[PDB]
Structures are given as C-alpha cells and as structure tokens.
Write a protein that binds this ligand. Sequence first.
Ligand SMILES: Nc1nc2c(ncn2[C@@H]2O[C@@H]3COP(=O)(O)O[C@H]4[C@@H](O)[C@H](n5cnc6c(=O)[nH]c(N)nc65)O[C@@H]4COP(=O)(O)O[C@H]3[C@H]2O)c(=O)[nH]1
Length: 286
Amino acid sequence: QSLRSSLLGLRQLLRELPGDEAPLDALAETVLALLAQYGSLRIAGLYRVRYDRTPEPQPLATLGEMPALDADDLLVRTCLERGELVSVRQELAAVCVPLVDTDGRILALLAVEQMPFFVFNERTFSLLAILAGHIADLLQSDRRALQLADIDAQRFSQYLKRSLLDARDHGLPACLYAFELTDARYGEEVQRLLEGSQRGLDVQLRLRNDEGRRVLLVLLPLTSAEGSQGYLQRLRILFAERFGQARELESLGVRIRQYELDAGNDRQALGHFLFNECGLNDQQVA
Ligand SMILES: Nc1nc2c(ncn2[C@@H]2O[C@@H]3COP(=O)(O)O[C@H]4[C@@H](O)[C@H](n5cnc6c(=O)[nH]c(N)nc65)O[C@@H]4COP(=O)(O)O[C@H]3[C@H]2O)c(=O)[nH]1
C-alpha cells in the first residue's frame, strides 16, 4: 500500500525539518492533505489538542470553506473524552478523528464537516483512525532525549506497541524475525549484513540472548505473510551476494525464528516468543 509509503513520505519530511520549531505546526498542511486523500474529504480542519484534552480554537490547516469550533460540540466532546473516532448517526460535525500516540496522548484533532456519503462508512473511518495513530507516533519525536534508553530501543518499543494496537484494533499484520547467530566466525559480518538490509519503517534491535549469542531482532510493521516471505527472499539474495552463491544462510550459523502478530493469538504469546523462545528479557524489549 501507499499507506507504508505515505507514512515513509511523512517521516522523511519530518526528518528534514529545521529542528527548531514544532512538527505539528510545520507539517499540518501535509498531514491534513494525507487525511483528506485517504478519507476523500471535502470540508475539514486540523487542530492542536492541549495536554488536558481540550482543542486549540484556531485550526492548523484548512480544507474547503471550514467554520470554527463552536463550543464543546457533542462530537468534539465525545471524541476527546473517548479518545476514539466518533461520527454522527448516519441517518442525518460529520466525523471527529483524534490523533493519538501509543502512550494515549492526543496530539491533534481532525474535524470533518463534509465527505462524500458513499465513503462515509466504517471502512473509511478505519483507515482514518489507522492513519491518525501512525501520524501521532511520528510527530511524537521529542522528550526521548530525556530517557536513558538508546534511540533504537525507544523506536523499536514504540513501533512494536503500535503494531500490537494495529493488530488488536484493526487486524493489521506485522511480523517479527529473530536472527540468532550461532557461529562466531561469521556472526559479526552476518549482523552487519542484516543491519544494512533495513528498509523503510522496519526497526531492529541488536541483542545478546541468555546463551551469549548475537540476536538481531527485526520488526516489520504492516507486513502480511506474503511479503514477510518477500523479505526473506530478498535477504537470501543479499546473503548469496555477500557470502557464497554456493552457500546458504543457515551454513553461516543463522537460526531463524519468526512470529506473526495476530489478534487471534493468545495475549501471552508475543512474550512467550521473545522471552524463553528467543531467550531475551524485559530489559531488552518492552
Ligand atoms: N517489511 C518489509 N517487507 C519487505 C522487505 N523486503 C521485501 N519485502 C516484501 O517483499 C516484497 C518484494 O520485495 P522486493 O522483491 O524487494 O521488491 C520491491 C523492490 O524492488 C521495490 N522496493 C520497495 N521498497 C523499496 C525500497 O525502500 N528501496 C528500494 N530500492 N526498492 C524498494 O519495490 C518492490 C515491491 O515492494 P513491496 O510492494 O513493498 O513488496 C515487498 C515487500 O512486501 C523489507 O526489508 N521489509
């Protein structure tokens, strides 16, 4: 999908930002255009939402002839109280979509007054809420350089939690691969090759399991089983280049463990997979 790409588009617009103002302010037009592109919206506004869940009166960006927030509008009110997307009774201030990061913090409000009736359904609402959540996360970029954990640990943890929320609420797929490197002669060069393979939005952790062996953990957000397979196919081609074509990944001591995130999975399953299947612990992944 252009979902991954649009998010990658936005993230790398953010990564080029001066770094001296505020992402919500600088990117509000593009954020709204994104939300509009996906919801086929005609009249809408993007609004900052302050720490105590009250909306900032003046819109960050407009789309079409768009009137102001009148008061504690029922739809705006329930949106920010429930922290969920709220829309009016179909049988008709059309939709209110909050942008909420993985910590539950509301960063913004998409307030819609007009969108084609034929798209005013659960399918489009879902896509709006998905996009809102991911955009909220990418704007989060701050207060992290006041945490002891490395930037890679922080990112991995947020992306993983977003992936679990996406599986739980929207049935969106993601995959984890743990590469355990069992042969010390090849381990470092294999890990370097895996680190260099990282592509858009996948996030990695460089770890050591309980048995002292290198483990390179890779999360693939928004990635189906098709596709996790495309990833491994790509990776084997890269290994063939780096090491023998005459040779396979497993002959370098690579053991692969894979976990597919599924809302249907038991609640303890991801923890079972990482801790004691992969031999990792809660100080490494949280
Ligand atoms: N999460 C994740 N999934 C992966 C990865 N590598 C492969 N896949 C999955 O396998 C499919 C085939 O990838 P490909 O053969 O590299 O074929 C790719 C590749 O030729 C090109 N492409 C996509 N993204 C990039 C990129 O960031 N850089 C470059 N150079 N090419 C890309 O577009 C083709 C289609 O890509 P997709 O539709 O995304 O479909 C991809 C994707 O679903 C990965 O590192 N992470």
